[PDB]
Amino acid sequence: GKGKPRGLNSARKLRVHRRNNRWAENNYKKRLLGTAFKSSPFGGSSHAKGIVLEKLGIESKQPNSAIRKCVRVQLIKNGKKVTAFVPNDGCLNFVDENDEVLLAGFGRKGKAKGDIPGVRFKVVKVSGVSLLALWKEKKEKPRS
Amino acid sequence: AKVHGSLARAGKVKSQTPKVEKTEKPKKPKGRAYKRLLYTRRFVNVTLVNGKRRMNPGPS
Amino acid sequence: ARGPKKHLKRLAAPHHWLLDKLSGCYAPRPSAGPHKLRESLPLIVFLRNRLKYALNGREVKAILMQRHVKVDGKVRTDTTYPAGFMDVITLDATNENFRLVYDVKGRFAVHRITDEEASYKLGKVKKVQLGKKGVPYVVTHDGRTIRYPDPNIKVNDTVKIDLASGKITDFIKFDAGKLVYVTGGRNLGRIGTIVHKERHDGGFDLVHIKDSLDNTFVTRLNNVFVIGEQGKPYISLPKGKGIKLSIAEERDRRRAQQGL
Amino acid sequence: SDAVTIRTRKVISNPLLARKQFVVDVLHPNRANVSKDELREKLAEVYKAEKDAVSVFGFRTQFGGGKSVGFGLVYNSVAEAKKFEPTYRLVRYGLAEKVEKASRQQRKQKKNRDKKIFGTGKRLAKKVARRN
Amino acid sequence: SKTYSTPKRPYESSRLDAELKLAGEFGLKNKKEIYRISFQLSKIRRAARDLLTRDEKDPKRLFEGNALIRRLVRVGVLSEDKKKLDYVLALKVEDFLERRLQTQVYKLGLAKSVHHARVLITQRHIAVGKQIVNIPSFMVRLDSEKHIDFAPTSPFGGARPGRVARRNAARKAEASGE
RNA sequence: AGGAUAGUGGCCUACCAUGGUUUCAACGGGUAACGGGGAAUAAGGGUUCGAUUCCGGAGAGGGAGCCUGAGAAACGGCUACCACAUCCAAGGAAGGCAGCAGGCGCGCAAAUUACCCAAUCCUAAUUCAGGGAGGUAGUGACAAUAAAUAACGAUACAGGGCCCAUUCGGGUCUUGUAAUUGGAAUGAGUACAAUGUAAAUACCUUAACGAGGAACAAUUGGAGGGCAAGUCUGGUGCCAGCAGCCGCGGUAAUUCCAGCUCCAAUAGCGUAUAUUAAAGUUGUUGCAGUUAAAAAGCUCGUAGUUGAACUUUGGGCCCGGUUGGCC
16 A cells, blocks of 8 residues: 555654655755754855965876876865865966965865865965966966 | 875976967957848858758868 | 834835835824724825825925814814724815715725715714713714713614714614625625624624625624615715626726727 | 927816916927926916916926926915925025025034033133043 | 746757747847747746636636737737637747837838848837837837838938938038038 | 732742643754745645845843833943943043944955935924935946847849740849948937936936947857767877866877867856755655565554444425527
């Protein structure tokens, strides 16, 4: 008889069953328990400013071979240290150390992207200006 | 995960490109006119072998 | 909280004043008076919005501060004076006596009447009590106390008031075969000759009503108001007579009525 | 001014304000579009006020032009106008003078200063140390 | 107090073909205009779907269906031969675009192209009745067809030749007996 | 039973009794929780959101207490303590923007120390005063609506429909290409004016000036598949870099850096996060459970869920409603 109760007065069993079984999809468990606000260096935010501690060359995952030119970044609102990827050939030269950058997610909603291991974020802005603008020479970085 | 990677090689190809400059060309229309242009270029001119057409065919 | 509200916003004001809502701001709050906040019509609304004699509140005030307009034989220079059902408004300009009545859609119909009909008004007795020194009194829907009436005036009857002397000329009982003007409810503005009554002790007495088109319906006795016998009202009724021609009949009219 | 052609729609008499209130409709082809004062003159010429018991306002032009519509009043006396009509319209028509008063926040500052009650004598001499 | 929406699959070449054909036939600058007509048509269709689910000789059906039909007839989308609340579902974007003014200008003559018609409309020429109009998306109500004409202003219908002729008259005709 | 209260009442206590709630989820914890009207997205069912422009609850740095009064446990009102903090001729005094505008911090993340009571309405002994409530403008690509960036000819090339249906006669014409060229239409922008407005700025009107490109110049993303659009050129050579996924790149790269061309949406287009559909991948509608995840070791058993058939059927006679269909 399909397992579930079909009876006209079984709505309690049905809804308590749902309540207990919704804790098997990742999205529901995330929403309810709260993992953005506890874990997740961006506390449920889309972006986050951080101070560049270091530049890094991450060797890609197999079967590819390359060095991906990321940065170690300390966040301002948490103090969490975070690796973040600098796209768009060059732009590791346009960043420098102790620069203020703005980080965004690297696209895949938590989990990492492509051949870059451990990295979950990308750099969007440096010292108030966009890396895209600097790369296309629409603007120039403020030094002073 | 990894410290070692010689960051000097950054910007290599974009620095090494044989910079070509953009050719100044006539102005393309914008909007209603462009749609007129495309309607012509689609339903007037081109087709290909026995059933087909291509919109950016390379020279052969 | 902390005392009573003095303001009233556009969107909170009863729908039968017809002004505008979204951050259109404020509406005229009826002052305390004989009638309730929602079942009333202030003079600012009666004059600026319906008759179009004025365009602004300062114009309405300029009118009211000249003893031109009087409600029930009394001037009422207050801007937000709550005028209500079966209230007589008298302007010596054009000698227009306005009765406030209801159209069938529930708005306040602007009925024009004769001076002889403006001489009086009607009142539904809400309670009948003894006052101090054994003096019986009746209270109407317009907060009018009347001492020493006929002892047959029981509750929910209606009364004819002479409006200059607050005295009773004649009363009409609540019984079957009596006309009714519904005040309040979905069926507001309908006129339908009581069929019968349903008691329900402790439970909101109901009344079954029958329009001239034999369109029976049901209302609450607090919302019922008698006005006369079968086919002999005591007031000039408005254009419509409380029938509620359905939307279909209405479009049939305003398409076949007139090509204008 | 070729066939200016003023018309008056929706005429209401208002004895309790002593006015006739109506809608002005100007059909004004191929000219400089309205001239409110030309309307005042052309309208007093037919409502018998000579200029000044007439007030008129609002006057939007149809898209495309050649026509404008506004609201109009004509009173039974210039006195009735000068008491009923508002002072900004009287100033527009030159039948009054807009008072030269101070700015709003200046008036308010003055009120807040005058909320503090004093003037008697040589204690006048040490107001350099009020707020500093 | 606001409204509009757009399609589902951003590609699908058959749609692109159809949309661009309509755009070229009717003189349009965007796919947003086709999307707009499809949106209107969807509202109409789902309304009529609900009414058809209702009972026949049902008051809401009669009222709202006759109203919808009357509106579409007086616009001229729904022909007066088919007035039964099923061709309302059978309608199409071509049937609306044919009643657009730009199209009506061209089909009534007077412009020798839909693009010229659009230009004339937006250049403070064509008027409807006597009101000048500058919107191609106007939906003539089947009676102003015999009132679409050049304006009392607007050369090709009236007064001063404007700018280019006015200036060339001085560049040329005044420059005769220098 | 009394006291207190505006009044009911363990509200408060005296005496007395020992009850009251709970697997139909009590009590406790959490809430990145004010509640609703409502919003977003959905074939239908639904999931998520709801600090807000209505409604009512609260609160005025935290707590507590109270005067006045019809109404306050009031904070643009007092009293105290705590915490922050201002003036000082150091004795004392005065504070509370989660009202308005500022823009110190916080940060991914949000405007002018502007004009006015002319409208909406409110208060006042009041038609006259006041009102940062409110309206007006400024900043404003939050979102939405409409909608320019060009149209039509003539000559040189590749075609022809129809008028007079009197032979290749004139053509009101037609589909694209030009180091071919013409006169026409304007508006964006300036701006006399009036209009608009409390007064202005804009809108709608409108004299005059305001297109021919080198000019009044539309971007944003992409061109391996998914997924519309390169069997082009140059460079680099598992490097640089692209890539949501699958995958490109190791000396002939349809994926990188550029040029050309082409595509999609277009004054809007991308990216990040969240959420909805897709997702019958939460499954009441509507999943699955031999072997892909999952039948409990087996039986008993309470709550819960679910529970065999049977009791006035059938036949007539009238009344008057809605639809047809002669005419």
